From a paper:
Kremen 1 and 2 have been identified as co-receptors for Dickkopf (Dkk) proteins, hallmark secreted antagonists of canonical Wnt signaling. KRM1ECD emerges as a rigid molecule with tight interactions stabilizing a triangular arrangement of its Kringle, WSC, and CUB structural domains.
We further succeeded in determination of a low-resolution LRP6PE3PE4-DKK1CRD2-KRM1ECD complex, defining the architecture of the Wnt inhibitory complex that leads to Lrp6 cell-surface depletion. Diffraction data collected from the resulting crystals were highly anisotropic with diffraction extending in the best directions to 3.5 Å and 3.7 Å but only to 6.4 Å in the third direction. Despite the lack of high-resolution diffraction, the general architecture of the ternary complex is revealed. DKK1CRD2 is sandwiched between LRP6PE3 and KRM1Kringle-WSC. KRM1ECD does indeed bind on the opposite side of DKK1CRD2 with only its KR and WSC domains engaged in binding. Overall, the DKK1-KRM1 interface is characterized by a large number of polar interactions but only few hydrophobic contacts. The crystal structure gives an explanation for DKK1 loss-of-binding mutations identified previously (Wang et al., 2008): R191 of DKK1 forms a double salt bridge to D125 and E162 of KRM1. Similarly, the K226 side chain of DKK1, which points to a small hydrophobic pocket on the surface of KRM1 formed by Y108, W94, and W106, forms salt bridges with the side chains of KRM1 D88 and D90. The LRP6PE3PE4-DKK1CRD2-KRM1ECD complex structure reveals no direct interactions between KRM1 and LRP6.
Residue numbers in the entry:
A (entry chain B): 30 to 97, 103 to 322
B (entry chain A): 628 to 1005, 1013 to 1246
C (entry chain C): 182 to 249, 259 to 266
Amino acid sequence: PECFTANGADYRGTQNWTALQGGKPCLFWNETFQHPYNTLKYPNGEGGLGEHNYCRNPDGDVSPWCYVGVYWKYCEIPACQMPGNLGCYKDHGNPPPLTGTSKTSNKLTIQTCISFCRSQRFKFAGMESGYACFCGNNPDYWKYGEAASTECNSVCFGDHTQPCGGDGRIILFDTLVGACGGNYSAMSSVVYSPDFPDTYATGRVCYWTIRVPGASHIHFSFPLFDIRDSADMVELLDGYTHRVLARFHGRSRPPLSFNVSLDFVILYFFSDRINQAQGFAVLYQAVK
Amino acid sequence: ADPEAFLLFSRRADIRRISLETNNNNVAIPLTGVKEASALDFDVTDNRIYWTDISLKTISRAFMNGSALEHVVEFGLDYPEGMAVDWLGKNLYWADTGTNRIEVSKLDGQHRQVLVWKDLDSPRALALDPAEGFMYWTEWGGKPKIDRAAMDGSERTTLVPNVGRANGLTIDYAKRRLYWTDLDTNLIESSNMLGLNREVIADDLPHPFGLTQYQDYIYWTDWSRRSIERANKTSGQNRTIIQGHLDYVMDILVFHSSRQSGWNECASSNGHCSHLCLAVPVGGFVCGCPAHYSLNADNRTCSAPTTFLLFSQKSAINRMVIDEQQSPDIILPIHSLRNVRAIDYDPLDKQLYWIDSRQNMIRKAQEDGSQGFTVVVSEIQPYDLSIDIYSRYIYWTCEATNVINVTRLDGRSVGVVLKGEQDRPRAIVVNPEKGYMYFTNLQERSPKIERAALDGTEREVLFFSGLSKPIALALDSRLGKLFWADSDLRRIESSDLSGANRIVLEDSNILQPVGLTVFENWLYWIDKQQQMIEKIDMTGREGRTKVQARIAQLSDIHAVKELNLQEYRQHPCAQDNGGCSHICLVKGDGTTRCSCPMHLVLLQDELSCGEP
Amino acid sequence: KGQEGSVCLRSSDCASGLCCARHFWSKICKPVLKEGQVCTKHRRKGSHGLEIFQRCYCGEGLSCRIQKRLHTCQRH
Ligand SMILES: [Ca+2]
């Protein structure tokens, strides 16, 4: 996966088309001087801009895009889909994809819908039209069919940097995403900060149990790591002994990746009472 | 005024004030229960601020200190996105995109009148000019435009057609120019007071929304940049951001005395007008009246609508007229209305009566809304009522005790006129001109319509077959016709007051009738599930006509004719109740008796009533 | 099902000649645009997200093209 954010802000891939089928070719960021975003405004490669025409998201909108009175289009990138984001699916009405429960909120985000569905004990959470949340334990949320991720690009009413479905189009999320704690038993999965994809709240103390019976070692990587303060810190603990393996805070970034020869690791997170940030996304990969 | 001009702006949950300086103090106005504030105006003379709430569906006001929080308008509003204060005449103008009406009332709220209703398609912003007597508004239809009219809703005309969704319409009174933001093209344009000499002030703006002006600057709000900015009004340069980090700023305004300057005849003694004083460009002003009221020949005083038709929903009682200009139906502003079941009107005192189904009481109030009074309370469960206008009584049916109980308008009870073990009176309509009453007796297995005298004597079953749910009754005293509607059988039938000549008027494309009333030579009725007011010609000249549609939860409908006071007093129970203590009956030969309820008996006076 | 002005979530909730578009911070059934009527066309990309007064799409066999500045529904 090339994205671990809700809107592909960290996308640095090689797709230079608005869609792989029936799309339009993107313009180069080093020759879009008519427009706001280009290489002259942003030297040092800020926001992933450079001498290329690959899709990017520098402005902080709901999805990656490129220039092409239509002078831009959203990029339908298959790889750019954050682990946890199960996909954009259709909603033809009665019954809905997720049948558990539902609410409406004028301050809705991806997390606030997830936190609502997690609070009612539902595994899946789905946002529609920017403001309508839906919850359920339904295995057939795909019943009406999968839609293109560009069709689920209506802004969340609380946060304009996030996608929250569309007109008869539901973006789904596993309720483990942004939960203050949880158990992980898959070969490979991602663990986000609390309240992701919103900014993590102050005074959080959350811990996630990664345990893969049979794994010789686990390959931890940090595709996203935006922790503000030194008092804020992400810790990896040995599951058996509870010994602190590593400490990562604002003034101590993690590597690209590192191996831990264990089948049982406890990721911890501690948030202070000063400043908030986007958070993190720890992709682990067990090896047998 | 000597205080410096300060900037007010609405922002969803709260309204805040700031100075003209960059990054100066920012304080919220201490208001309570504000959910979604949109439009914004003020009154410097009263030291008051006015705003519209699209979540509450209201137009409120309060002082700068936060005290005197009161809802000025809170009925018949869907999306009041535009609003403005007539400071000279002391009136409150507003525009509603959902209902498609430009309305006006006093600043406190009373005497509401619709100025523009025909040919409106979502009027958004609103800018008044009571010194000159013009009002200007932006329109967000299929073809958006900026129209102009006189402040009495006269002389309507399109000022600039070729424009997008214009917002923040504001008048530069010193140099005589109109300014507005455009949401489609994202620019601030300017033109003179006739919509010519059109110039673009600022084109390179991301999302300019709210707008106002003062001295030699324009102040606008931006959704993209999240800021309140200003610039030179003519040039569009000398640009400075006043405030930042402001999410979803709706409207912006300059609070100063020089903004509300000028003068007209309405500022002096309200132009001697009885209700409303409306400024005009040619002739100074003109005296307006409330909705439906007729302005008298003297061009000052008003009289309430002579003839009108009342129809009630679950949570409101409406009023409509039969005008050539299809004048729009209004919601009567009664605060006491929660769950109405039936309605009836007293044309002598001009007051509205209804049955609250939840609270179980017969309440009273005039069309204004004031002079509220409960006449019957508790067990008692009123179903339907019918007012004897001559004897000053209400004949109503109780679902609890199963009786036709009669009560005075003031409150005190007359007595029960009809009771039985197996009897269940439900629908009720009186005919005191002839001296009879008509009611649906829904007995178990066998429903039936019955006639009786107003004391409960001379009972007889008019119809006992071809019935299932006799739900609503209505009669015409002039032509001598009785009408009833059936819910289950899905039809409206008719006959004479005697019972002969039973004919089915309509029995197709009807689902659930719940009310009947006669207006001139037309039988108006209401359908709950279809959600339509429809009518048919009783003579049979003209066809079936649909009056209105999309009216949810229709309960009861009632026509009101103007009371002929001379012809009223020809009725012998009109004056002194015919000398009777309780019921005043009319004989077949036009002479009056005096009768009593069940529990009383007529005495040797043949007037008073005593117990057996 | 939903009438013009009634609260909706999806366009399926509304009637035949209506679509579900956002007004302020809730969606209501608005009518679909016919030939000649003004349609939405976003200049900036962020203005799509900031739009709280959404118009419906142009009808069957209509495209949101420029007038001959604003855009109107015109045939192909
Ligand atoms: Ca913190």
